[PDB]
Write a protein that binds this ligand. Structure first.
Ligand code: DT4
Length: 291
Protein backbone atom coordinates (compact mmCIF):
# COMPACT_ATOMS: atom_id res chain seq x y z
CA UNK A 1 0.00 0.00 0.00
CA UNK A 2 2.76 2.44 1.05
CA UNK A 3 4.57 1.57 -2.19
CA UNK A 4 1.66 3.48 -3.77
CA UNK A 5 0.31 6.99 -3.57
CA UNK A 6 -3.44 7.34 -3.83
CA UNK A 7 -4.23 9.82 -6.61
CA UNK A 8 -8.05 9.56 -6.38
CA UNK A 9 -10.96 7.30 -5.56
CA UNK A 10 -12.07 6.03 -8.95
CA UNK A 11 -15.03 4.11 -7.47
CA UNK A 12 -16.16 1.29 -5.14
CA UNK A 13 -16.53 -2.40 -6.05
CA UNK A 14 -18.11 -5.53 -4.53
CA UNK A 15 -14.79 -6.49 -2.98
CA UNK A 16 -13.64 -3.09 -1.68
CA UNK A 17 -12.45 0.36 -2.64
CA UNK A 18 -10.71 1.11 -5.99
CA UNK A 19 -8.12 3.85 -6.25
CA UNK A 20 -6.18 5.38 -9.06
CA UNK A 21 -2.65 5.13 -7.65
CA UNK A 22 1.00 5.65 -8.54
CA UNK A 23 3.93 3.38 -7.91
CA UNK A 24 6.25 5.49 -5.76
CA UNK A 25 9.28 3.57 -7.08
CA UNK A 26 8.46 3.14 -10.81
CA UNK A 27 5.92 5.96 -11.32
CA UNK A 28 3.54 3.56 -13.04
CA UNK A 29 -0.11 4.63 -12.89
CA UNK A 30 -2.33 1.79 -11.76
CA UNK A 31 -5.71 0.75 -10.41
CA UNK A 32 -5.30 -0.25 -6.74
CA UNK A 33 -8.01 -2.43 -5.28
CA UNK A 34 -8.16 -3.37 -1.60
CA UNK A 35 -10.00 -6.64 -1.16
CA UNK A 36 -12.28 -7.33 1.86
CA UNK A 37 -7.25 -14.19 3.56
CA UNK A 38 -7.71 -17.86 2.64
CA UNK A 39 -5.13 -19.92 0.70
CA UNK A 40 -7.50 -20.78 -2.19
CA UNK A 41 -8.04 -17.08 -2.93
CA UNK A 42 -4.24 -16.75 -3.01
CA UNK A 43 -3.74 -19.67 -5.42
CA UNK A 44 -6.72 -18.59 -7.52
CA UNK A 45 -5.63 -14.95 -7.72
CA UNK A 46 -2.17 -16.18 -8.70
CA UNK A 47 -3.45 -18.36 -11.56
CA UNK A 48 -5.14 -15.12 -12.71
CA UNK A 49 -1.74 -13.35 -13.02
CA UNK A 50 -0.83 -15.67 -15.89
CA UNK A 51 -4.13 -15.30 -17.64
CA UNK A 52 -3.00 -12.46 -19.88
CA UNK A 53 -4.76 -11.07 -22.91
CA UNK A 54 -5.08 -7.64 -24.66
CA UNK A 55 -8.83 -7.60 -23.95
CA UNK A 56 -8.35 -8.44 -20.23
CA UNK A 57 -7.28 -5.61 -17.85
CA UNK A 58 -3.81 -6.84 -16.78
CA UNK A 59 -3.26 -7.94 -13.17
CA UNK A 60 0.17 -6.38 -12.57
CA UNK A 61 0.71 -7.61 -9.02
CA UNK A 62 -0.91 -9.31 -6.10
CA UNK A 63 0.22 -7.95 -2.76
CA UNK A 64 -0.38 -10.06 0.34
CA UNK A 65 1.25 -8.26 3.27
CA UNK A 66 0.15 -7.02 6.71
CA UNK A 67 -2.28 -9.96 6.40
CA UNK A 68 -4.27 -7.59 4.09
CA UNK A 69 -5.05 -7.99 0.32
CA UNK A 70 -4.37 -5.59 -2.59
CA UNK A 71 -4.60 -6.04 -6.35
CA UNK A 72 -2.69 -3.83 -8.76
CA UNK A 73 -4.23 -3.64 -12.22
CA UNK A 74 -3.33 -1.86 -15.41
CA UNK A 75 -5.20 1.54 -15.35
CA UNK A 76 -7.94 2.44 -17.89
CA UNK A 77 -9.66 5.90 -17.91
CA UNK A 78 -13.31 5.08 -18.62
CA UNK A 79 -15.88 2.35 -18.34
CA UNK A 80 -18.57 1.55 -20.91
CA UNK A 81 -21.35 2.69 -18.55
CA UNK A 82 -20.09 6.30 -18.49
CA UNK A 83 -19.25 6.16 -22.18
CA UNK A 84 -22.77 4.99 -22.97
CA UNK A 85 -24.19 7.86 -20.94
CA UNK A 86 -21.91 10.39 -22.66
CA UNK A 87 -23.25 8.85 -25.89
CA UNK A 88 -27.00 8.87 -25.12
CA UNK A 89 -28.07 11.44 -27.79
CA UNK A 90 -27.19 9.43 -30.93
CA UNK A 91 -25.88 6.24 -29.32
CA UNK A 92 -22.57 4.50 -29.98
CA UNK A 93 -22.12 3.96 -33.76
CA UNK A 94 -22.70 0.39 -34.82
CA UNK A 95 -19.06 -0.07 -36.03
CA UNK A 96 -17.90 0.78 -32.52
CA UNK A 97 -20.57 -1.42 -30.93
CA UNK A 98 -19.43 -4.22 -33.25
CA UNK A 99 -15.72 -3.71 -32.49
CA UNK A 100 -16.39 -3.66 -28.76
CA UNK A 101 -18.45 -6.87 -28.91
CA UNK A 102 -15.80 -8.51 -31.12
CA UNK A 103 -12.98 -7.66 -28.70
CA UNK A 104 -14.83 -8.86 -25.63
CA UNK A 105 -15.75 -12.15 -27.37
CA UNK A 106 -11.99 -12.40 -27.96
CA UNK A 107 -11.28 -12.00 -24.26
CA UNK A 108 -14.03 -14.44 -23.34
CA UNK A 109 -12.88 -16.97 -25.91
CA UNK A 110 -9.44 -16.80 -24.32
CA UNK A 111 -10.38 -17.22 -20.66
CA UNK A 112 -13.16 -19.69 -21.36
CA UNK A 113 -10.55 -21.80 -23.14
CA UNK A 114 -8.61 -21.94 -19.86
CA UNK A 115 -11.92 -22.75 -18.10
CA UNK A 116 -11.96 -19.36 -16.43
CA UNK A 117 -15.28 -17.53 -16.25
CA UNK A 118 -16.16 -13.98 -15.22
CA UNK A 119 -19.66 -14.73 -13.78
CA UNK A 120 -20.38 -11.01 -13.33
CA UNK A 121 -19.97 -9.06 -16.58
CA UNK A 122 -21.57 -5.58 -16.54
CA UNK A 123 -20.85 -2.26 -18.31
CA UNK A 124 -18.95 -1.06 -15.22
CA UNK A 125 -16.36 -3.81 -15.57
CA UNK A 126 -15.80 -3.16 -19.24
CA UNK A 127 -13.02 -0.59 -19.56
CA UNK A 128 -12.01 1.48 -22.59
CA UNK A 129 -8.95 3.39 -23.72
CA UNK A 130 -8.34 5.99 -26.46
CA UNK A 131 -6.86 3.35 -28.75
CA UNK A 132 -10.33 1.92 -29.36
CA UNK A 133 -9.66 -1.06 -27.07
CA UNK A 134 -12.16 -2.41 -24.55
CA UNK A 135 -11.12 -4.73 -21.71
CA UNK A 136 -12.67 -7.02 -19.15
CA UNK A 137 -12.00 -6.02 -15.51
CA UNK A 138 -12.10 -8.22 -12.39
CA UNK A 139 -11.94 -11.39 -14.43
CA UNK A 140 -11.98 -14.49 -12.23
CA UNK A 141 -12.52 -12.62 -8.96
CA UNK A 142 -15.99 -14.05 -8.36
CA UNK A 143 -14.63 -17.60 -8.08
CA UNK A 144 -11.68 -16.23 -6.07
CA UNK A 145 -13.70 -14.52 -3.27
CA UNK A 146 -17.52 -15.00 -3.43
CA UNK A 147 -20.39 -13.02 -5.05
CA UNK A 148 -22.50 -11.04 -2.47
CA UNK A 149 -25.91 -9.31 -2.53
CA UNK A 150 -24.74 -5.94 -1.12
CA UNK A 151 -21.26 -4.41 -1.49
CA UNK A 152 -19.18 -3.39 1.53
CA UNK A 153 -21.07 -0.07 1.16
CA UNK A 154 -24.42 -1.84 0.91
CA UNK A 155 -24.72 -0.92 -2.78
CA UNK A 156 -27.13 -3.40 -4.30
CA UNK A 157 -25.40 -5.59 -6.86
CA UNK A 158 -27.13 -5.61 -10.22
CA UNK A 159 -29.12 -8.57 -11.43
CA UNK A 160 -29.59 -6.99 -14.88
CA UNK A 161 -27.00 -9.19 -16.63
CA UNK A 162 -27.53 -12.41 -14.75
CA UNK A 163 -28.16 -15.60 -16.79
CA UNK A 164 -31.47 -17.44 -16.11
CA UNK A 165 -29.74 -20.68 -14.97
CA UNK A 166 -28.20 -18.75 -12.09
CA UNK A 167 -31.45 -17.05 -11.19
CA UNK A 168 -33.01 -20.52 -11.20
CA UNK A 169 -30.61 -21.83 -8.51
CA UNK A 170 -28.21 -23.71 -10.73
CA UNK A 171 -25.19 -24.53 -8.55
CA UNK A 172 -22.80 -25.06 -11.45
CA UNK A 173 -21.98 -22.20 -13.80
CA UNK A 174 -20.67 -22.80 -17.31
CA UNK A 175 -19.03 -20.20 -19.55
CA UNK A 176 -22.48 -19.62 -21.12
CA UNK A 177 -23.29 -17.21 -18.32
CA UNK A 178 -20.81 -14.69 -19.75
CA UNK A 179 -22.25 -14.94 -23.29
CA UNK A 180 -25.68 -14.28 -21.85
CA UNK A 181 -24.42 -11.21 -19.94
CA UNK A 182 -22.51 -10.02 -23.00
CA UNK A 183 -25.70 -10.48 -25.01
CA UNK A 184 -27.56 -8.22 -22.58
CA UNK A 185 -24.82 -5.58 -22.91
CA UNK A 186 -24.84 -5.93 -26.70
CA UNK A 187 -28.63 -5.17 -26.68
CA UNK A 188 -28.15 -2.27 -24.28
CA UNK A 189 -25.53 -0.61 -26.53
CA UNK A 190 -27.88 -0.81 -29.53
CA UNK A 191 -31.11 0.34 -27.83
CA UNK A 192 -29.62 2.77 -25.28
CA UNK A 193 -31.72 1.06 -22.62
CA UNK A 194 -30.88 -1.94 -20.43
CA UNK A 195 -32.51 -5.14 -21.72
CA UNK A 196 -33.76 -6.64 -18.40
CA UNK A 197 -33.49 -4.08 -15.54
CA UNK A 198 -34.86 -6.23 -12.68
CA UNK A 199 -34.80 -4.98 -9.10
CA UNK A 200 -35.27 -8.41 -7.49
CA UNK A 201 -34.50 -11.98 -8.52
CA UNK A 202 -38.09 -12.71 -9.41
CA UNK A 203 -38.52 -9.37 -11.18
CA UNK A 204 -35.39 -10.18 -13.20
CA UNK A 205 -36.65 -13.68 -14.04
CA UNK A 206 -40.01 -12.32 -14.97
CA UNK A 207 -38.65 -9.56 -17.20
CA UNK A 208 -36.64 -12.18 -19.09
CA UNK A 209 -39.77 -14.40 -19.21
CA UNK A 210 -41.85 -11.60 -20.66
CA UNK A 211 -39.37 -10.75 -23.44
CA UNK A 212 -38.28 -14.32 -24.24
CA UNK A 213 -41.29 -16.52 -23.24
CA UNK A 214 -41.46 -18.60 -20.05
CA UNK A 215 -38.96 -21.43 -20.61
CA UNK A 216 -40.37 -24.94 -20.75
CA UNK A 217 -39.12 -28.46 -21.48
CA UNK A 218 -39.40 -27.79 -25.27
CA UNK A 219 -36.77 -25.05 -25.45
CA UNK A 220 -34.99 -25.93 -22.19
CA UNK A 221 -34.75 -29.62 -21.22
CA UNK A 222 -34.48 -30.05 -17.45
CA UNK A 223 -35.74 -26.54 -16.67
CA UNK A 224 -38.79 -27.65 -14.64
CA UNK A 225 -36.54 -29.59 -12.24
CA UNK A 226 -34.28 -26.67 -11.41
CA UNK A 227 -34.03 -25.73 -7.72
CA UNK A 228 -36.04 -22.46 -7.93
CA UNK A 229 -38.36 -23.41 -10.72
CA UNK A 230 -42.10 -23.34 -9.81
CA UNK A 231 -44.91 -24.75 -12.01
CA UNK A 232 -46.86 -21.73 -10.80
CA UNK A 233 -44.66 -19.34 -12.89
CA UNK A 234 -46.86 -17.23 -15.20
CA UNK A 235 -46.68 -18.32 -18.85
CA UNK A 236 -45.67 -15.53 -21.21
CA UNK A 237 -45.29 -15.76 -24.99
CA UNK A 238 -41.94 -14.98 -26.58
CA UNK A 239 -41.88 -11.54 -28.18
CA UNK A 240 -40.49 -10.65 -31.58
CA UNK A 241 -36.80 -9.74 -31.72
CA UNK A 242 -37.45 -7.10 -34.29
CA UNK A 243 -39.46 -5.60 -31.41
CA UNK A 244 -36.72 -6.17 -28.86
CA UNK A 245 -33.66 -4.56 -30.46
CA UNK A 246 -34.61 -2.27 -33.34
CA UNK A 247 -33.03 -1.02 -35.37
CA UNK A 248 -30.35 -3.76 -35.23
CA UNK A 249 -29.98 -5.63 -38.55
CA UNK A 250 -30.59 -9.25 -39.45
CA UNK A 251 -27.10 -10.44 -38.68
CA UNK A 252 -27.09 -8.70 -35.33
CA UNK A 253 -30.50 -9.96 -34.24
CA UNK A 254 -29.44 -13.41 -35.46
CA UNK A 255 -26.30 -13.25 -33.27
CA UNK A 256 -28.05 -11.72 -30.22
CA UNK A 257 -30.68 -14.43 -30.39
CA UNK A 258 -28.02 -17.19 -30.08
CA UNK A 259 -26.32 -15.37 -27.19
CA UNK A 260 -29.68 -15.32 -25.36
CA UNK A 261 -30.79 -18.94 -25.74
CA UNK A 262 -32.37 -20.31 -22.55
CA UNK A 263 -30.55 -23.62 -22.50
CA UNK A 264 -26.92 -22.85 -21.67
CA UNK A 265 -25.76 -25.77 -23.88
CA UNK A 266 -27.49 -24.34 -26.93
CA UNK A 267 -26.16 -20.82 -26.20
CA UNK A 268 -23.46 -19.83 -28.74
CA UNK A 269 -19.87 -20.13 -27.48
CA UNK A 270 -17.50 -17.12 -27.68
CA UNK A 271 -15.50 -19.14 -30.17
CA UNK A 272 -18.47 -19.58 -32.54
CA UNK A 273 -19.79 -16.06 -32.11
CA UNK A 274 -16.48 -14.70 -33.52
CA UNK A 275 -17.24 -16.60 -36.72
CA UNK A 276 -20.81 -15.19 -36.99
CA UNK A 277 -21.58 -13.21 -40.19
CA UNK A 278 -22.28 -10.15 -38.03
CA UNK A 279 -18.52 -9.75 -37.77
CA UNK A 280 -17.81 -10.02 -41.49
CA UNK A 281 -17.30 -6.27 -41.89
CA UNK A 282 -15.77 -5.65 -38.44
CA UNK A 283 -13.36 -2.69 -38.07
CA UNK A 284 -11.56 -0.98 -35.18
CA UNK A 285 -12.81 2.66 -34.94
CA UNK A 286 -11.51 5.15 -32.43
CA UNK A 287 -14.02 6.56 -29.99
CA UNK A 288 -14.17 10.25 -29.18
CA UNK A 289 -13.33 10.03 -25.45
CA UNK A 290 -13.58 13.15 -23.28
CA UNK A 291 -11.28 12.43 -20.32
N1 DT4 B 1 -16.26 6.50 -14.04
S1 DT4 B 1 -15.21 6.61 -15.17
O1 DT4 B 1 -15.73 6.26 -16.39
O2 DT4 B 1 -14.66 7.88 -15.21
C1 DT4 B 1 -13.90 5.48 -14.81
C2 DT4 B 1 -14.12 4.10 -14.91
C3 DT4 B 1 -13.07 3.22 -14.65
C4 DT4 B 1 -11.81 3.72 -14.28
N2 DT4 B 1 -10.77 2.87 -14.05
C5 DT4 B 1 -10.95 1.69 -13.44
C6 DT4 B 1 -12.02 1.50 -12.58
C7 DT4 B 1 -12.19 0.26 -11.98
N3 DT4 B 1 -13.18 0.08 -11.07
C8 DT4 B 1 -14.37 -0.68 -11.37
C9 DT4 B 1 -13.88 -2.12 -11.55
C10 DT4 B 1 -15.09 -3.06 -11.66
C11 DT4 B 1 -15.94 -2.95 -10.39
N4 DT4 B 1 -17.09 -3.85 -10.49
C12 DT4 B 1 -16.42 -1.51 -10.23
C13 DT4 B 1 -15.22 -0.58 -10.11
N5 DT4 B 1 -11.28 -0.72 -12.20
C14 DT4 B 1 -10.24 -0.48 -13.04
N6 DT4 B 1 -9.26 -1.29 -13.42
C15 DT4 B 1 -8.48 -0.59 -14.28
N7 DT4 B 1 -9.02 0.66 -14.40
N8 DT4 B 1 -10.09 0.69 -13.64
C16 DT4 B 1 -11.61 5.10 -14.20
C17 DT4 B 1 -12.64 5.97 -14.47
Amino acid sequence: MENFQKVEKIGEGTYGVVYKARNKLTGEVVALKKIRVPSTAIREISLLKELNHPNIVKLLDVIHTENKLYLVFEFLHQDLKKFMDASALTGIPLPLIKSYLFQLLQGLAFCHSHRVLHRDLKPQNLLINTEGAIKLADFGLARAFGVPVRTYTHEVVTLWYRAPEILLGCKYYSTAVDIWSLGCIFAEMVTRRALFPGDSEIDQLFRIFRTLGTPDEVVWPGVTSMPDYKPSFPKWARQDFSKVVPPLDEDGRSLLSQMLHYDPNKRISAKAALAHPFFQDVTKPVPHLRL
